[PDB]
Amino acid sequence: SLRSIFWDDGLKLIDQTKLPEKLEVIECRNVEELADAIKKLAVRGAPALEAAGAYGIALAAREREFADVDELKEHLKKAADFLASTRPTAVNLFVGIERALNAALKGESVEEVKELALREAEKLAEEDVERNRKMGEYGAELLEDGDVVLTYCNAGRLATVDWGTALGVVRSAVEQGKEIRVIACETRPLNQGSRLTCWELMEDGIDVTLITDSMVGIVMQKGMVDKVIVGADRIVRDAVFNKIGTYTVSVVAKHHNIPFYVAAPKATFDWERTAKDVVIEERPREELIFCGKRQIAPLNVKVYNPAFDPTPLENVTALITEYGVIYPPYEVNVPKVLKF
Amino acid sequence: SLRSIFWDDGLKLIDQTKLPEKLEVIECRNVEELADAIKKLAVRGAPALEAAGAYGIALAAREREFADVDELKEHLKKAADFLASTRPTAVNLFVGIERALNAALKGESVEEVKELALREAEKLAEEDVERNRKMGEYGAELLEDGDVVLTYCNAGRLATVDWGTALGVVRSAVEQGKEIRVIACETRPLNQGSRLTCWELMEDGIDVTLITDSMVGIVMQKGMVDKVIVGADRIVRDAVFNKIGTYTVSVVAKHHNIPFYVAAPKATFDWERTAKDVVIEERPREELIFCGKRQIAPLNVKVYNPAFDPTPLENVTALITEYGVIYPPYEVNVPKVLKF
């Protein structure tokens, strides 16, 4: 399969806005194109965005030819500024941008700056893949042959450079020859579960059954789920922030004594904070009013559309990271395992 | 506001297929037009279908002229058979048809048959409205000024002849002068929540905020909900069957100590059965694969689409009926309040 974003004679990305109907690889030949790809969510997922930020700098340095280095460098600082502005709050996009820029600026000739930019970006993408496979191997130990895994949103290979976090754990277990099947929640209101998760799993030959988010209750009630594995957008000392709905799934799983796992790398932890420090942004109200171009609600209806919810760590059986599986008490084990 | 189906110099019914974009009333001049309406789902809900079936017979009696009483009576039998066949599994439609036909057959002249047919249809329609007002009045006592009520699917005036069951309690409380606000779950995959519940509450001036089904968790986490009131499709000895997703709401509400009420008339109870006696039918897989005409899942994805789920009675704080509020233990109080 393809990595979600990579370099092959230029910046290439899987155009996720085209899924699930068509697999389309697009080419970003300039700063603006990548930026809009980022805006349209053609590229998404923290690692994917980090790699986008880094390849962005390699791209900006190759955009057009340069006779003088200092002019090249000046341009990179501008491009870095422009790309990060696509969303100032994207920590990963910021990390990718600054790491690639920092490295490229270390060059003393036009070629050096060009090669160093690309080399740092390729290294960062490679490290994300390695991190997910390592995390996957650790997580696979929590899966048994015949297990049915319920997941939420899309913490897979489209959201990372490759392999995935939560779905990376499923891929690692399948690789070990364990028969694993997945139940995926459609994940309203943007349907990342039906559009993306079902696509990447079917593409890779992993059994998947699609259900509405609200069906999480009946499937556990019927004993159709052995474990839940979700990803995370941010992990603070008392909670896991992930795509809205995750907390709901955690409540049903807890009541049914179903193991609930969160797969996320060390970089997703923000251990100096607690849930009270986090502000949850509201997403566009139209995501609940129209579906495709079909109006599904009165045009002027009031909408509450939070982007994420906090799942208390009390509802998390274990955290699966590239440093290993972490169990409660998290206050003790998170610092220990992540080597804070 | 308008009854969902009613008689005013001819049969008229709100075309639900047009909501929420627009309000359109269908006038049925003959039995075929009523059948078309029933078939396209312009008429919705057990009580509305029972009324549609009864009005169907009153309509068949007015459809063309009859010089002979026996010809009219035979005609009503043919019409009864045809109407029932539009939706052969619709038990309530069948019921309205049989009661209307039986009462009409008591007429001894063309004029009397026509008269008795409409009288019976009007009587059954009226009994539903009355049933819902009484239920609402008993239920309103459970609500207080400033309550925010979370609902699911659409148990309102659209799904009945008028007033509604769960939303009827909200209407009765508001008429009492209590400020009541509603939070409505969109109710996937057919979106009865956003298409119908939001429409009728907005039409009637009742505050309503729309959320996805998965947001029941955060909304309760943040204390935005004071009470939950849902309807029911069937209440057996150990469970309430209602639109899929209802059970999930009951799990979250229970964990958060939020009263969970089920409003339904006595006819919805099936006390000689238990959950294991009920088969939950699957709904068309396309409901999860497409939205409007936008593809949201891979065309060949495996889908699990149950129509309802069972909410254990242990998760229901009280049942609101036209005979009064009923509290646990239900094995004792249901037969006593419902006069079994």
Tokens of B90: 């619709």
DSSP string, B232-248: -SEEETTEEEEETTHHH
- Indicate the helix (H) or strand (E) that contains B169: helix B166-175
Asked whether the beta carbons of B8 and B36 are under 8 A apart, the reply is no
- Known binding site: residues of B? 44-46, 87, 192, 242-243
User: A209 and chain B: CB distance < 8 Å anywhere?
Assistant: yes
Residue with tokens 């496979």: A133
Tokens of B303: 């889908």
Q: What angle do CA A60, A63, A69 make, to 5 degrees?
A: 70
Asked whether the beta carbons of B177 and B147 are under 8 A apart, the reply is no
Asked whether the beta carbons of B132 and B163 are under 8 A apart, the reply is yes
Burial level of B9, CB count in 10 A (0-12/13-18/19+)? exposed
Write out chain B residues lying below 8 Å of A214, CB-based.
185, 187-188, 213-214, 244-245, 248-249
User: A216 and chain B: CB distance < 8 Å anywhere?
Assistant: yes
Solved using: X-ray
Query: Per the CB < 8 Å rule, is B296 touching A194?
Result: yes
Query: How is the beta sheet containing B208-211 ordered, strand by strand?
Result: A302-303, B208-211, B180-185, B147-151, B227-230, B260-263, B318-321, B324-326
Asked whether the beta carbons of A318 and A327 are under 8 A apart, the reply is yes
- Any binding-site annotation on A192? yes
User: A293 and chain B: CB distance < 8 Å anywhere?
Assistant: yes
The distance of A45 to chain B (nearest Cα, Å) reads: 19
Q: How many A/B residue pairs have CB atoms within 8 Å? A: 197
Classify B26 in phi/psi space as left (phi over 0), alpha (psi -120 to 50) or beta: beta
Give the whole-angstrom CA distance, residue B7 versus residue A20.
48
Q: Which of B315, B259, B25 shows the shortest CA–CA distance to B143?
A: B259
Asked whether the beta carbons of B16 and B5 are under 8 A apart, the reply is no
φ, ψ of residue B43 in degrees (nearest 5): -105, 130
Angstrom CA distances, A324 to A161, A294, A314, A315, A329, stand at: 20, 46, 19, 19, 15
Nearest to B303 among A207, A209, A300 (CB): A209
Residue with tokens 């593809």: B295
What lies within 8 Å, CB to CB, of A150 at 6+ separation is A182, A183, A184, A185, A216, A219, A220, A225, A227, A228, A229, A249, A253
| Helices B91-104 and B69-86, packing angle to 10 deg | 170
What stretches of chain A show up as alpha helix (H) in DSSP?
31-39, 46-60, 69-84, 91-104, 110-140, 166-175, 192, 198-203, 216-221, 246-255, 286-289, 330-337
Is the sign of the CA dihedral A166, A171, A174, A176 positive or negative?
negative
Nearest to B210 among A251, A288, A309 (CB): A288
Q: Where are the domains of chain A?
A: 1-141, 142-340
Rg (C-alpha) for chain B, rounded Å, is 21
Give the whole-angstrom CA distance, residue B199 versus residue B203.
6
What lies within 8 Å, CB to CB, of A307 at 6+ separation is A243, A244, A280, A281, A282, A283
User: A206 and chain B: CB distance < 8 Å anywhere?
Assistant: no
Residue with tokens 């009226």: B126
| Breaks after residues in chain A, judged by C–N over 2.5 Å | none
Give the whole-angstrom CA distance, residue A38 versus residue A49.
8
Strand partners, B321: B324
Query: Per the CB < 8 Å rule, is B210 touching A294?
Result: no
Burial level of B305, CB count in 10 A (0-12/13-18/19+)? buried
* Chain A (42-81) residues lying within 8 Å, Cβ to Cβ, of chain B: none
Tokens of A286: 């139209």
Tokens of B253: 């509400």
Closest-approach residue (CA) in chain B for A218: B309
Give the whole-angstrom CA distance, residue B312 versus residue A21.
40
User: A255 and chain B: CB distance < 8 Å anywhere?
Assistant: yes
- Any binding-site annotation on A176? no
What stretches of A190-306 show up as alpha helix (H) in DSSP?
192, 198-203, 216-221, 246-255, 286-289
How does B221-249 read in b/e, with b if 16+ C-beta sit within 10 Å? beebbbbbbbbbbbbbbebbbbbbbbbbb
Burial level of B328, CB count in 10 A (0-12/13-18/19+)? middle
The residue type of B337 is: V
φ, ψ of residue A8 in degrees (nearest 5): -155, 85
Which of B191, B195, B212, B222 should be substituted to probe chain A, the one whose Cβ sees the most A Cβ atoms within 10 Å? B212
Q: Which of A337, A313, A317, A216 shows the shortest CA–CA distance to A259?
A: A317
Query: Per the CB < 8 Å rule, is B198 touching A293?
Result: no
CATH 3.10.129.10 fits B142-340, yes or no: no
The distance of A172 to chain B (nearest Cα, Å) reads: 22
Nearest to A189 among B212, B249, B250 (CB): B212
The residue type of B177 is: G
Asked whether the beta carbons of A181 and A208 are under 8 A apart, the reply is yes
**Three-state SS sequence of B29-71:** CCHHHHHHHHHCCCCCCHHHHHHHHHHHHHHHCCCCCCCCHHH
Residue with tokens 């990595």: A3
Q: Which of B115, B166, B113 shows the shortest CA–CA distance to B143?
A: B166
The residue type of A47 is: P
Q: Which of A144, A96, A92 shows the shortest CA–CA distance to A118?
A: A96
Nearest to A195 among B20, B187, B297 (CB): B297
Strand partners, B330: none
Rg (C-alpha) for chain A, rounded Å, is 20
Write out chain B residues lying below 8 Å of A190, CB-based.
none
The residue type of A194 is: S
Q: Which of A2, A3, A64, A7 shows the shortest CA–CA distance to A30?
A: A64
Query: Per the CB < 8 Å rule, is B210 touching A304?
Result: yes
- Any binding-site annotation on A46? yes
Strand A308-312, strand A239-243: pairing = antiparallel
User: B198 and chain A: CB distance < 8 Å anywhere?
Assistant: yes
SS3 assignment, position A89 = coil
Asked whether the beta carbons of A273 and A236 are under 8 A apart, the reply is yes
* Chain B (166-195) residues lying within 8 Å, Cβ to Cβ, of chain A: 183, 185-189, 191, 194-195
Strand A260-263, strand A227-230: pairing = parallel
Nearest to A303 among B202, B210, B252 (CB): B210
The residue type of A340 is: F
The distance of A131 to chain B (nearest Cα, Å) reads: 29
Give the whole-angstrom CA distance, residue B93 versus residue B261.
27
Give the whole-angstrom CA distance, residue B54 versus residue B52.
6
Query: Per the CB < 8 Å rule, is A251 touching B219?
Result: no
Tokens of A13: 């990305």
Task: Centre a 10 Å sphere on the Cβ of residue A292 and count the other Cβ atoms it contains.
Answer: 12
Give the whole-angstrom CA distance, residue B37 versus residue B86.
10
DSSP tag of B300: T
- Indicate the helix (H) or strand (E) that contains A149: strand A148-151
Query: Per the CB < 8 Å rule, is A303 touching B191?
Result: no
Give the whole-angstrom CA distance, residue A246 versus residue A311.
7
φ, ψ of residue B137 in degrees (nearest 5): -65, -45
Strand partners, A311: A240
* CATH fold for the domain made of B1-141: Four Helix Bundle (Hemerythrin (Met), subunit A) (1.20.120)
Burial level of A148, CB count in 10 A (0-12/13-18/19+)? middle
φ, ψ of residue B207 in degrees (nearest 5): -55, 130
The residue length of chain B stands at 340
β strands within B152-295, DSSP E: 180-185, 208-211, 227-230, 234-236, 239-243, 260-263, 290-291, 294-295
Query: Per the CB < 8 Å rule, is B215 touching A245?
Result: yes
- Any binding-site annotation on A45? yes
Write out chain B residues lying below 8 Å of A244, CB-based.
212, 214-215, 218
User: B228 and chain A: CB distance < 8 Å anywhere?
Assistant: no
The catalytic residues of A are 233
Angstrom CA distances, B122 to A29, B32, B33, B108, stand at: 71, 20, 19, 20
Structure resolution in Å?
Answer: 1.9
Residue A47 C-beta-side C-alpha neighbours within 13 Å: 33
Asked whether the beta carbons of B218 and B209 are under 8 A apart, the reply is no
Give the whole-angstrom CA distance, residue B53 versus residue B49.
6
Write out chain B residues lying below 8 Å of A241, CB-based.
none
Query: Per the CB < 8 Å rule, is A293 touching B292?
Result: yes
Asked whether the beta carbons of B28 and B56 are under 8 A apart, the reply is no
Give the whole-angstrom CA distance, residue B88 versus residue A258.
41
Strand partners, B294: B291
Give the whole-angstrom CA distance, residue B210 versus residue A72.
51
Q: What long-range pairs does A85-91 form, CB within 8 A, spacing at least 24?
A: A86/A35, A86/A38, A86/A39, A87/A38, A90/A49, A91/A46
Nearest to A202 among B199, B211, B301 (CB): B301
Classify A41 in phi/psi space as left (phi over 0), alpha (psi -120 to 50) or beta: left
